[PDB]
Write a protein that binds this DNA or RNA. Sequence first.
RNA 1: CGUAAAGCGCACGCAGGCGGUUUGUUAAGUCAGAUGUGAAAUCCCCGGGCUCAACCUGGGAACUGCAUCUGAUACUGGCAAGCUUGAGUCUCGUAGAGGGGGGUAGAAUUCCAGGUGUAGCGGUGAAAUGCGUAGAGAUCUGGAGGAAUACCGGUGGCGAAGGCGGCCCCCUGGACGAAGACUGACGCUCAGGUGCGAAAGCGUGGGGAGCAAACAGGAUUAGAUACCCUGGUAGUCCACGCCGUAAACGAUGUCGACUUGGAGGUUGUGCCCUUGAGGCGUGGCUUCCGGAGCUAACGCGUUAAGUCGACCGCCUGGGGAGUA
Lengths: 88, 218, 129
Amino acid sequence: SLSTEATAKIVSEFGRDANDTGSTEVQVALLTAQINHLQGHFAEHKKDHHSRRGLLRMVSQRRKLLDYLKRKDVARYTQLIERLGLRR
Amino acid sequence: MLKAGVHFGHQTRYWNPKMKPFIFGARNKVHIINLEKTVPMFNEALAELNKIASRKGKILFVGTKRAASEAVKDAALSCDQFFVNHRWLGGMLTNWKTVRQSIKRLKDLETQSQDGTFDKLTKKEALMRTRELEKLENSLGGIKDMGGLPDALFVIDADHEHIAIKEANNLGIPVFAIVDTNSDPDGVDFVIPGNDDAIRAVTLYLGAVAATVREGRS
Amino acid sequence: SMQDPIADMLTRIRNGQAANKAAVTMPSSKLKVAIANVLKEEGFIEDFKVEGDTKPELELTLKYFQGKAVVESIQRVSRPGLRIYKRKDELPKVMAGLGIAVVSTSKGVMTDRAARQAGLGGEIICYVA
RNA sequence: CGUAAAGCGCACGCAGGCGGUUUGUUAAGUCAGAUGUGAAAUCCCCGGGCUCAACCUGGGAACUGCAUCUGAUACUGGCAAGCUUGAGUCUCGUAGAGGGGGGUAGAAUUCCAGGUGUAGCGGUGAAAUGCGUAGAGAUCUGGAGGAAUACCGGUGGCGAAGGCGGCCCCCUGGACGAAGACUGACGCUCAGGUGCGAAAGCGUGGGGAGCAAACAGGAUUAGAUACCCUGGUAGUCCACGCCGUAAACGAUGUCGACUUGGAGGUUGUGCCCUUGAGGCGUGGCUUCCGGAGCUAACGCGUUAAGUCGACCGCCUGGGGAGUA
Ligand SMILES: [Mg+2]
Ligand SMILES: [Mg+2]
Ligand SMILES: [Mg+2]
Ligand SMILES: [Mg+2]
Ligand SMILES: [Mg+2]
Ligand SMILES: [Mg+2]
Ligand SMILES: [Mg+2]
Ligand SMILES: [Mg+2]
Ligand SMILES: [Mg+2]
Ligand SMILES: [Mg+2]
Ligand SMILES: [Mg+2]
Ligand SMILES: [Mg+2]
Ligand SMILES: [Mg+2]
Ligand SMILES: [Mg+2]
Ligand SMILES: [Mg+2]
Ligand SMILES: [Mg+2]
Ligand SMILES: [Mg+2]
Ligand SMILES: [Mg+2]
Ligand SMILES: [Mg+2]
Ligand SMILES: [Mg+2]
Ligand SMILES: [Mg+2]
Ligand SMILES: [Mg+2]
């Protein structure tokens, strides 16, 4: 998983303030960081189906959170999309 | 209050969940029967038995459990009442017709034991007759002079005399029982939470019930 | 997940009644309180109370007449998967008048007898007998 | 819908179905009244005439529907704003054959070379085929190679299922517990779709000790295309790709709530002098027995096959046939 230092960096950089680990932006940012990191792991190996099932769970959770944010506040949804690089 | 001595319940985990309202529970993994709860019920049961005794009905002590048997052949036998201190043979009540012949055989042999044929014929036939006689005596004793169904039952133990309780319920006869924490109520019309194993405690119950039945119609 | 809190309230009463519990407790709600009020005034439960402010908790005191329970059968009718609405003339009566059918009319929750007198129908919440 | 026909092998998920709690608003569903319409006949309810009846006939009721108008606002829906109990994030730890890659260790089998030694070895119910005087089997030394990891070991653990056991490193998924903070319904289910999915089997390239379909011989038998014996190829092993099926079973779909108990296993954690391996609690998973209830019965029984709610899958006599 993400290192403690790495996790703290995203939290403080996406949340409205420190110790705001629950905001949707922080949650989506953390999932995005881990999904991107795992791409290297699965480029090698490529047969770790059991771990990939965990990866797909991250992808599904992020999709649901993004859909919720888009329905709640479009302005924040967009700004997050460009910042993290996600397509839709 | 603690009118009794020191019995403080019995049994440990072999406890029937239906006894929860009567349990105090505490020391060294042993259930403690709430004496405060039994005193009013015990007095209430004693009163009802007194009412029946004044009506001059039977009450049918049963304490097959040894170390409780003789205590029904003790002053408990005093009152003009009936008891079963040994194995309760199934059907003693629910078919009184068949057991009627057995008591009739008992009566005939009791007469022959002193006045009739007791010495004639080989000693072997004499000794078999006597051992057969005592077999009837200890199997169905005080019940001999009953001559009908009773009006109430008194059971020292409930889960140990369940056959007698079931027969009484089948025939609609009131049942007064000392139910321990392991025992099962709901077959008993008048439950008396209290230890039924201790010799001292069971004597206390028998004495109190004996005393209230000494007072018959007055 | 929890889809029908009303059916949850009904089954809590049914189970607790069969277990000979003295009282049953559950999360509170306006509709639950309204239904509980109708049950009390019809004689099916002793009383009811709500506690707490942020997480209100509703407690009902069950009733026993003899060794047996009072609420013989309590059944949910209009459920989330299929909602039942009746007109004034089509309001049901449970076991021929004995027992009640809780109905949510435009003037609040009330029994079928009360709704029929007021001349208006509504949603059939449940049957109690 | 455990065993009578019936839970997809298992998951993730779009459409769809359903959705915690408070306030305000709307009035679409819903409810109340009214208006228009709903042909006549027919059916039903109240009289006569055919002498009665059938039959004819006056009036009503009904036509359960639709549209519009006016109201009601509990519930469902829409809209706005909240809340924290569902759901999720963060901090510190715990146990584990969870997964993918690489390395390595000991025991044993087979083979190769050599030594010592001599007549049997092996096998079966008994035999024979077979091996051996070209020196076997037995015993000792050295070497090659493949496969699997005794003891630990445990109705023990982990995983969605299939499944996963030597030891070490690297990359990696999930679960659980303590206390606190954070978001604020973000949830459940899921046709079609996508992914994973024992063994056998298939393609290409390797590898090959043991075992062993096919095959060969020896036995048994009335026969013996077998069971038994002696050999033995594919395969079993590795890399990549396909196959997509099993008594893939708990013959028991997923999620949530509620309902008496007893005895165990395993893994956390709080407090009390640990004043040894103690005492009192509080979570997760798991085995056995049993109460009410349920069940045709067997049995299930807080891990339900009990009492309920949401969604999905499937059954409609046997054979023909899961076949054309
Ligand atoms: Mg995580
Ligand atoms: Mg069958
Ligand atoms: Mg079947
Ligand atoms: Mg299944
Ligand atoms: Mg799913
Ligand atoms: Mg709602
Ligand atoms: Mg409307
Ligand atoms: Mg017409
Ligand atoms: Mg006429
Ligand atoms: Mg007419
Ligand atoms: Mg609303
Ligand atoms: Mg499908
Ligand atoms: Mg294979
Ligand atoms: Mg191959
Ligand atoms: Mg090959
Ligand atoms: Mg063979
Ligand atoms: Mg199949
Ligand atoms: Mg299997
Ligand atoms: Mg199995
Ligand atoms: Mg099946
Ligand atoms: Mg059982
Ligand atoms: Mg076919």
